[PDB]
Each structure stands twice: as C-alpha cells, then as structure tokens.
Design an enzyme around this catalytic site. Structure first.
Site, PDB file in Angstrom:
ATOM      1  N   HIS A 164     -10.266  23.312  24.994  1.00  0.00           N
ATOM      2  CA  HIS A 164      -9.220  23.493  24.255  1.00  0.00           C
ATOM      3  C   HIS A 164      -8.045  23.605  25.354  1.00  0.00           C
ATOM      4  O   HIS A 164      -8.270  24.427  26.156  1.00  0.00           O
ATOM      5  CB  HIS A 164      -9.330  24.296  23.311  1.00  0.00           C
ATOM      6  CG  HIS A 164     -10.152  24.558  21.989  1.00  0.00           C
ATOM      7  ND1 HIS A 164     -11.054  25.576  21.786  1.00  0.00           N
ATOM      8  CD2 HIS A 164     -10.210  23.874  21.014  1.00  0.00           C
ATOM      9  CE1 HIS A 164     -11.726  25.330  20.622  1.00  0.00           C
ATOM     10  NE2 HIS A 164     -11.111  24.144  20.144  1.00  0.00           N
ATOM     11  N   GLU A 167     -18.781  27.099  15.845  1.00  0.00           N
ATOM     12  CA  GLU A 167     -18.655  26.712  16.924  1.00  0.00           C
ATOM     13  C   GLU A 167     -19.408  27.696  18.237  1.00  0.00           C
ATOM     14  O   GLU A 167     -19.738  28.817  17.736  1.00  0.00           O
ATOM     15  CB  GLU A 167     -17.137  26.999  17.346  1.00  0.00           C
ATOM     16  CG  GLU A 167     -16.450  26.940  18.629  1.00  0.00           C
ATOM     17  CD  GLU A 167     -15.078  27.421  18.743  1.00  0.00           C
ATOM     18  OE1 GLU A 167     -14.741  28.449  18.326  1.00  0.00           O
ATOM     19  OE2 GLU A 167     -14.395  26.675  19.367  1.00  0.00           O
ATOM     20  N   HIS A 224     -14.135  27.405  10.703  1.00  0.00           N
ATOM     21  CA  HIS A 224     -15.252  27.583  11.230  1.00  0.00           C
ATOM     22  C   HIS A 224     -15.513  29.006  11.874  1.00  0.00           C
ATOM     23  O   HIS A 224     -14.382  29.731  11.905  1.00  0.00           O
ATOM     24  CB  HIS A 224     -15.315  26.633  12.551  1.00  0.00           C
ATOM     25  CG  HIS A 224     -14.541  27.334  13.590  1.00  0.00           C
ATOM     26  ND1 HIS A 224     -13.175  26.576  13.987  1.00  0.00           N
ATOM     27  CD2 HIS A 224     -14.586  28.305  14.759  1.00  0.00           C
ATOM     28  CE1 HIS A 224     -12.771  26.909  14.924  1.00  0.00           C
ATOM     29  NE2 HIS A 224     -13.563  27.764  15.368  1.00  0.00           N
ATOM     30  N   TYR A 262     -17.949  21.758  18.414  1.00  0.00           N
ATOM     31  CA  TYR A 262     -17.725  22.083  17.018  1.00  0.00           C
ATOM     32  C   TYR A 262     -19.019  21.320  16.222  1.00  0.00           C
ATOM     33  O   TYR A 262     -19.109  19.941  16.382  1.00  0.00           O
ATOM     34  CB  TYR A 262     -16.411  21.445  16.330  1.00  0.00           C
ATOM     35  CG  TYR A 262     -15.445  22.339  16.697  1.00  0.00           C
ATOM     36  CD1 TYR A 262     -15.364  23.823  16.748  1.00  0.00           C
ATOM     37  CD2 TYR A 262     -14.034  21.932  16.469  1.00  0.00           C
ATOM     38  CE1 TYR A 262     -14.258  24.733  17.202  1.00  0.00           C
ATOM     39  CE2 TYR A 262     -12.917  22.729  16.492  1.00  0.00           C
ATOM     40  CZ  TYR A 262     -13.021  24.106  16.981  1.00  0.00           C
ATOM     41  OH  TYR A 262     -11.903  24.883  16.840  1.00  0.00           O
TER      42      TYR A 262
HETATM   43  C1  LIG Z   1      -7.548  25.104  18.857  1.00  0.00           C
HETATM   44  C2  LIG Z   1      -8.552  26.046  18.913  1.00  0.00           C
HETATM   45  C3  LIG Z   1      -8.816  27.140  20.094  1.00  0.00           C
HETATM   46  C4  LIG Z   1      -9.655  28.024  20.154  1.00  0.00           C
HETATM   47  C5  LIG Z   1     -10.706  28.163  19.255  1.00  0.00           C
HETATM   48  O1  LIG Z   1     -11.862  29.097  19.416  1.00  0.00           O
HETATM   49  C6  LIG Z   1     -10.709  27.295  18.202  1.00  0.00           C
HETATM   50  O2  LIG Z   1     -11.549  27.431  16.898  1.00  0.00           O
HETATM   51  C7  LIG Z   1      -9.699  26.448  17.855  1.00  0.00           C
HETATM   52 FE   LIG Z   2     -12.897  28.772  17.583  1.00  0.00          FE
END
Ligand SMILES: Cc1ccc(O)c(O)c1
Ligand SMILES: [Fe+3]
Ligand SMILES: Cc1ccc(O)c(O)c1
Ligand SMILES: Cc1ccc(O)c(O)c1
Ligand SMILES: [Fe+3]
Ligand SMILES: [Fe+3]
Ligand SMILES: [Fe+3]
Lengths: 296, 288, 288, 296
Positions: free
Chosen positions: A247, A266, A215, A256
């Site tokens: 996250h 994203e 992404h 997402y």
């Molecule tokens: C695991 C994760 C952490 C931050 C992000 O921007 C991502 O795309 C995935």
């Molecule tokens: Fe990301």
C-alpha cells in the site's frame, strides 16, 4: 508512555456458518480458540498476544461486524473516557463485566458512521503460550496456519468521517497519521488514526452506508510471512481480493482475502513509526490507486 | 495515546577522531548529516526520522557517551517532568535552547548509574527526504550505507540500576519489559525499559564503573537488511563484536560492531509488542 | 544439458547412538525417514527431493563419514565412469544393488585423501510428498524441524588435495569454482568443485589425517529460513559452531552445527551461479 | 557436468524508441550497458553475469523479439548441434563472428512456432566488476535500479508447440520440467523446458500468431528483492502487469511489468531444482489460473 486508549482490543464479527468459521479462523488464519460462552460465541486470539481474546465470531443471519473494542490503560482511564464521551454529547452504554467471557465491563457508544465502539480496561491475561522465564522467540503456534501476531486494526466504512475523526482526535486521544484527499474541494475521504506509534490502530473511509465493515487486520512478522499467508490461502481455496503487494498509504505490505462468510480480513506487516508530534501525510484523490496498490 | 516521554531523541557520543567519525557514520552506518556547530560537533539523523538530529559526535580524548536525550510530548510535559524529577530528589540542570543546533531547551539530570539523561520537547522537523503528499515508501537514501531507520535505544552500564529503575518507572513513565536475574541473589543484573509499545527504549546493566556506554542502537527494516549491514561492514573493514544473530531477550536479531573510535553500536530489527499493562519476562542469570 | 555426474546422491555418516541420531535427524534437522535395513542403518531424505535417500546413519564406535556418493545420468554413464576411473589408475569396487535399500549397484573408490567416493545411476524415486498434478509449492513437511531442501554438498579434509582435484576435473567432469591459495608455496589449500551450475557439489581442504569429514551440507530456501534453523537449534540445545553468517568463499549464508555424535552439518542458502566456462575465484591464505 | 547447451545467452528485443529504452534498461531495470555497434544496437548484461551481453535492443517500428540465443559448452559442441539440427530436418544459417559485438559465430534456425533461435559457444568474458581474488559478495551495482542477477529465460507464444518440444528435447538436450495439459484430447498448451537443473531455461505456450514474445525474465536474489523491484517500478511510472506474487508452476515468485515499448519482462526468483532424471509435473487446463497465480 502509552496512556489512555492503548490498542485495538477485540472485533466481534458474525459469520453465516459458525462451524466453518471456527475451522477457518483456527486452522487457516491460525488464531487460538480461547473459550465459547452460553450465547454460542467462540473467542480467539493471536498466539503472541497475552489477553484472552481479540476476535470473536457469532453465527448471525448476516455477515459483518457487531462492534470493535479498544483496551484502555486502567479502570480510572475507562471512567475518565466514558465521562469525556458524554460531555462531548455522545450517549454511552455500560455493558456489565462478564457479559463477554473473561472480560470486564466496557463502555459502548455509536459513532456518526453507524459503527459501535467499545472501551474496556479489563480482560484476563492468559499469556502467549510461551514461558515467562527464559522465553523462546516463538513456538509451534507460529506455524499453525497463517498465525498472525496481533489484531492490528480494522477499516470501517460509514458516513460523516469528519465527525468520527473529531471524536477520535479530540476525545479518544488519537491523531491523524495519513489521509486520502477527496476530489478538489478538500475534505478527508479516508482517514488513518493512531493512538500509539503504529501507522494506525483504526481507519475510516467515507461511505453512504453506515455500519459497514471493510476488514479487520492482522499483523505478520515479515514479507516472507506474507507470501506464506498467500500460499496457505490457496491451499485452502480461500478467495483472495488483492494478492501480495504494498500500500502507499502506510507503506504496509498486505493481502486481502475473504472468510467463508464473506468477511474480508487482512494479513499485513511493515510501515513507518509515527509519533503524536508528527504531521499527517496526504494522498491526492486522483493518485489513490498508487496509495491502494503501490507497485501497481 | 502516546504521552509523557515519547522516544529516544539523541545520543551525543565522543570520538577520538572527528574526521574518521564523520566518514564512518556518513558512509558505513549511512546516517544523514544535518549540521555542524561552532564547538565542532557534527549532527546526524536516520533517513526515515523527521527531526533534525538523533546522533551527535564530538571529538574528545576519550570515547563514550556524553548524554542521552528523550523527546517529550510538549512544553507543558517537559515542565511537569522537571518538577517531578526534583520532587523525586534529583538535581535538574536547564540547557538553553540553541545550545544544540535546531534544538530547544533541555532538562538534564544525572542518574545514580552515572549517566546523564536529557528531556526536550522542541527540535526542528526537517522531514525524511520524502514528500508529504503522495509519499513514496523510500528513496535512494535507504540504500546509502546501512541506512538505519531510527535511533532505537542504548544500553548503559552503571552501578545503581535498582534506583535507576525507580526513576524511569516512577517518574518518567517507563515500565519493565524484561530483566536478567542475579545469581539467585535475585536482584536485577540487567533491565530493559519501554516508554511506549517498543520492546525497549533504553536498557541498563549493573556495572561497578559508572557512566559506561555499551552501545547506541539503530533499527533496520528486516532480517535481510541485517545481512546487508553485515556485508557492508566487511567491505569497510569494520570490526564486528558479534556476527548477525538473535538475542533471546527482546527477540531482536542484531549485529554488534565498533566504530573507529571504539564506540559499540547495534543494527537490529524485530521484537515483540509489549504494552504498559504487560508483565515483564525474566531471564535466569545462568541462561544469559 | 546436465550429464555425467549429476549431484550429490548420499552421504553415509557414523553416529555413536543410533536412536538419539534418529531423533536429532528427524526432529531437529527435519529429514524424512524412509527406511531401516537389516544392518541397522536408517535412511533419510530431504522432503523436497524425489529419491529415496540422501543421508544415511549407521551406529559405530567413531563418528565420521563412511562414504559420499553421486548419482550419474544413467547406467551407460556409470559403466563409462568406472572404466575411465580405472584407466586413470584408480581401483574400483562394485557394490551390488540392494546392498543399500532401494539403491542400484555402485562404483566405489578411495581418493588419495582417504575418502571413499561412490557413483550410481539407480535410486528409487519416492516423490517429495506432493502430487505430480497441480503441485503446491510446499506442505507440512517444510515446517517439520529445520526441513532442508537437498543434500547440497560436503567438505572433506584430506592430504593430497591436488591429486583429488585432478581426478574430479579430469575424470568425473567437475570444474573448479573457487580456491584458497596456500600461504606462498602457492598450491591450493582448499578447493570447491562443481559438476553442475551450483557454487559447489563437493569441496576439499588439505589436511594431514585422511578421511576426515568436516561436514555435510543442507540447502535452505531463504536467509529467513537460516534464522529459523538457528532458533530451532537453540530450542533443542543444539551445539552451534559458528552461528548465522556469510561465507564469502562462496557468497552464501550459513550455520555450522553439531550432531549429538559430533558430526558437523551445515544449513545454508545463497550462492552465485557458475558454469563450466567460468574461471575460478581465488582466496589468499591470510584472507581465508 | 553441464555440457551441450549451457544456458540462455542473449535476447535481442525491438524497442519503439532507442532513447527511452537505454534509460529504462540501464536505470530502471538496472542492466549494465557494455557496448553499442555501428548498426545502432546497444548491448546490456546483468551485473553479476560474466559474459559481455545477455540483452540487446534495437530500435524498430514494432516491439517484440528478434531472436533468442543460448550459449553452448564449446566449438565442437556447436558443430555437433548444427549437424544434429540439420540431420533432424531443419535448415541452418551460420552468422560469422563479429556480426554481434564481442561475439563469435552462431547457428541460427527457425522453430515451428515462428521464433528464431540461436546457438553460440564464443563470447567475450568481461566479468562482474568485482575482483577475482578475495571477491566481495557484491558492489554498488547491485543497488543500481532493480539490478537482476541473470537472464533467466523467456516465454514464447506460438503454434506447433508439440513440434518445438521435440526439437528441444530430442536435439538440443532439454527436458520437460512442467507442462499445462490442454482440455481432454491430451496435448500440451504450455511447456517449461530445462537444459540444466534450473526449473526452466525457456518455455512455450500454444498460440495462433507466430513469433510472439510473452517476456524475457531476469532472476532476483530474494522475495524482498522482488518487493523492492515493484517499489522501483512504481517510482518510475512503469506499467505493471501482474503484481508481486507466486506462480504455481515452478514455485517461482514474480512480477510482470512492461517496458516503454510494450515488451513484457519478468523479475523472477525461487523455484525447485529439477534434474534430467525427474518426471515432469503437470497442471490441468482448468487450473491454469492457479498455474499463473498460486495465491490468487
Ligand atoms: C489503504 C490501506 C492502508 C493500510 C491498511 O491496513 C488498509 O487496510 C488499507
Ligand atoms: Fe488494513
Ligand atoms: C542483552 C540484550 C538484548 C537485546 C538488546 O537489544 C541488547 O542491546 C542487549
Ligand atoms: C570454505 C567453504 C566455503 C563455502 C562452503 O559452503 C563451505 O562449506 C566451506
Ligand atoms: Fe541493544
Ligand atoms: Fe558447506
Ligand atoms: Fe519467465
């Protein structure tokens, strides 16, 4: 100061249907269209960036990413890096200025992971639509669709992440901010790199297939803007992968979703502020669900 | 890549009452205390920072700022900058490692504006209270008092801001993000400089008296954190200069308040993301 | 259950320049115009409300409020309220349906503070611009100017507030949520009344001149919407009284701004959730 | 004016272990313990409410809800409602004052869905710990754990939902705010009822088994407070059901999480302001998923 590789400059992504890709990225994601060349490619940028483009789509037989570029400090830096890439052993291709609208010549090379990377120092400055004198905090552009603030980064999937890391940290001036430790018998399964004081400008995840695009990511202003992105996604029946959440990795809140051709994108915001003198954070493989979704 | 001067490292401010100073910064602003030296100075750091200190308070007969220090990439950079400062025409003083707790030696110099600036490359990393493995986004420290995340910058008032700008841009690798014009006598009355991609790491406003401190600034997470900070200030009878609002310059939403000794500090968040290749934004004097 | 007087129904305010009044209320505040009548009045409603109007403007020689009306449960309740108002000793005047576009007949009366209050049970429902089936949370309308959610209340300045309190609590089914003590003569210099579980549906402040309007108030979704409203105002050169901040005497954030004619309005959000069984909170005059 | 049934007053829930319950509700959810009786029940209340209790737990061999009570305006109101319930055809039970700590007598009855409902008018007012003169907006309590503002409502699962709606609307003075239409052959699969101007004080969903509890919900201040609640849950190993997201119905943001005994609860916020004169909104059965998760 910010020297060398400054920030992600642009992502060339291919969509199955250009028309609905145009509508989606302009009226849904809220990107500002900025030109369409003779090759049938249409350029976009976040309303708040100043350079001509950061996202360009091309109607291709398949979906995915063609290449990902990074703007560097200046032409002197560009030449400097091209040379360091060759001394390192990588073969470089110098794409002439003009090949891309309002863009200067760029240095392109292929990583062990199969992804094509670009480095350029020139790209016309169009501004952010706001006056250069007594500028307002924002304008109507901020309310057109999701309307992100900048191309924050992208996450690529390909083999040999270790080698990719070496090139980034030993050649491109990047540094490890965070990593996901693979099952015991450590090696990095996932890597988050920064060439600034952002949590990351780009990331890679170990994967058997090469040239895979997980992404491209867009920055949002606040947690409430993430919710609104979610509402907008629903109003336009946009398929969402993982709803609004946090996250662990980077502490960055996000969502997402998929674009009309299946290209995942994203919209996120937040995260801490690492500097080159900081030690990387690590996540154990077994605990990677928490690193992916933190609340859950 | 971030190289050269990396970020604001510390501010040493004078308080008329050390006792009350420690109380206010530990309870209200919610800075984490990390040490006290023999001189009687008390060291603090924002919870999310990793280095030992960023804010030091020293009892004195007058309030204000003693000096403001920036951390650099490495020793080689520090040595290089010292030579560029001297080659530029500035007198440099060397502060021995240890003079400040958990801090290496520093290169100190005085600006045409009267303020003392420092550069260092070494300062013990104590962490952010969170584990390095499977780290949580935050912990209880985040809710102790205002609990800012980092020392963001400071605004200094001095007489020769034009020459000051030269030094920061031509020697230290900073660049102009924004400025405030002078009554169509177009000279910059106020400048905002960044040595990164932050809206500003430091700023100066033209003023007859040299060495004046307008305020040290601390970063907050979000607009709601700004409101909470405003609530906490009220619960603690904290004198507020200007209530929660938005600055047109920097676009940051902040609150100006005064510490017991009279030092002004700022708690804000927001701002765009400028880079070295960007042209500065301007503000007419009349629209300030 | 919700019964008797339900909520603020409409406020009719006087504007010095009708056209410029329409432009401010529909472009800056972001109210939705719903009609114009033979008398020259223009009707607006908040996008999220369901009834035809909550805010009416009429060109006049002096700014201020002509009247404030509340919608009641039903026609039966309306009849009952009128009778009770009369038995209390007040004189009521019945305004015919249609006198106001899409509005049923109304029971009007004058309070001891000089303000005119109205009660009605009928008002055409036009919707909030969103389907009644599989409704979305919002649409383009919540981003047209400030775009408040509802006419939340008003703050009236008048003499004889003690008698006003009686009428509202003894006849109209309201209850005291918060009060501001008088200096020490100890009476109330200010009252915040509710006829629901909202912090306040209307409030009064003891003042020499009768019929004085302090402001009408509009509700916002979140603290960030308040910041946004602040920005839109600046963009439109809107005169702001007191900028974004916390009230305290109601625990809600807010911005006081002025109409081009000089009528103050409020955009705010927040507040706790009082119920008829709760005792009122109080504020000392000096602390007020 | 608010009259009749004012608002949700209390929910007594069964936990498989009183210890794990007391640490979880007082420390994770951030409820405030106000008492414990000789029957082995511990009382809790949200920090900002004024009454002695809104949530009671009892250790038993099974999880679930024992009963849900609502507070009424006054004694006369409580008698009037008791008479109306019986006159409606429902048998009623009178529990004397004191059976529950700091609580007056209440009227209990069973719904066609198999859930026990209670009505009371007397309950000691303890306050919110803040002064009654020149009160602050909040104190340290609001930062103790999640720290919700009030018991907002509960969602009950049962059969004969149509009969339940009739009782609440024709007898208890509630009104339909939103509903979920069942496939052709119109009937309601879901119902959201209000006895005030809140989007809902209680809701029911058609289900085979009787007496089933979906969850008790607690109100939060803002969207960001919801994110924080999710962070705290992760920090406490709390199993999360539905991550931070918006609803569809009620526009309310939320997070479904489970307590140690398996009881689901919600941290909720937002929603519009319905009034008794408003017509209910409807969601087609087919769109139920947008009903529960607007964004995804
Ligand atoms: C695991 C994760 C952490 C931050 C992000 O921007 C991502 O795309 C995935
Ligand atoms: Fe990301
Ligand atoms: C005038 C101004 C603008 C932005 C700031 O952060 C500040 O401290 C001052
Ligand atoms: C004194 C006061 C308190 C709260 C309000 O919303 C208001 O308009 C006035
Ligand atoms: Fe500042
Ligand atoms: Fe008000
Ligand atoms: Fe619920």
């Amino acid at each position: 100061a910010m020297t060398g590789v400054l920030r992600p400059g642009h992502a060339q992504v291919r969509v199955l249907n250009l028309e609905e890709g145009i509508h989606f990225y302009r009226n849904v994601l809220g990107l500002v269209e900025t030109g369409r060349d003779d090759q049938g490619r249409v350029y976009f940028k976040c309303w708040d960036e100043r350079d001509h483009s950061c996202y360009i789509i091309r109607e291709a037989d398949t979906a995915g990413i063609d290449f990902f570029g990074f703007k560097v400090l200046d032409k002197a830096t560009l030449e400097k890096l091209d040379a360091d890439l060759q001394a390192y052993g990588l073969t470089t291709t110098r794409i002439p200025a003009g090949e891309m609208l309002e863009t200067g010549e760029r240095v392109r090379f292929e990583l062990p992971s199969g992804h094509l990377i670009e480095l350029y120092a020139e790209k016309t400055c169009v501004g952010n639509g706001i006056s250069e004198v007594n500028p307002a905090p924002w304008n109507a552009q901020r309310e057109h669709g999701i309307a992100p603030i900048q191309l924050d980064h992208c996450l690529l999937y390909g083999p040999n992440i270790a080698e990719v890391q070496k090139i980034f940290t030993e050649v491109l001036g990047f540094y490890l901010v965070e990593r996901v430790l693979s099952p015991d018998g450590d090696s990095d399964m996932g890597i988050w790199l920064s060439c600034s004081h952002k949590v990351h400008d780009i990331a890679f995840v170990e994967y058997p297939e090469k040239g895979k695009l997980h992404h491209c990511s867009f920055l949002l202003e606040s947690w409430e803007q993430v919710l609104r992105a979610g509402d907008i996604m629903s109003m336009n029946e946009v398929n969402v992968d993982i709803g609004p959440t946090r996250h662990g990795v980077t502490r960055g809140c996000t969502i997402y979703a998929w674009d009309p051709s299946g290209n995942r994108f994203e919209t996120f915001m937040g995260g801490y502020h690492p500097y080159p003198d900081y030690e990387p954070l690590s996540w154990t493989y077994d605990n990677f669900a928490q690193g992916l979704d933190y609340p859950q």
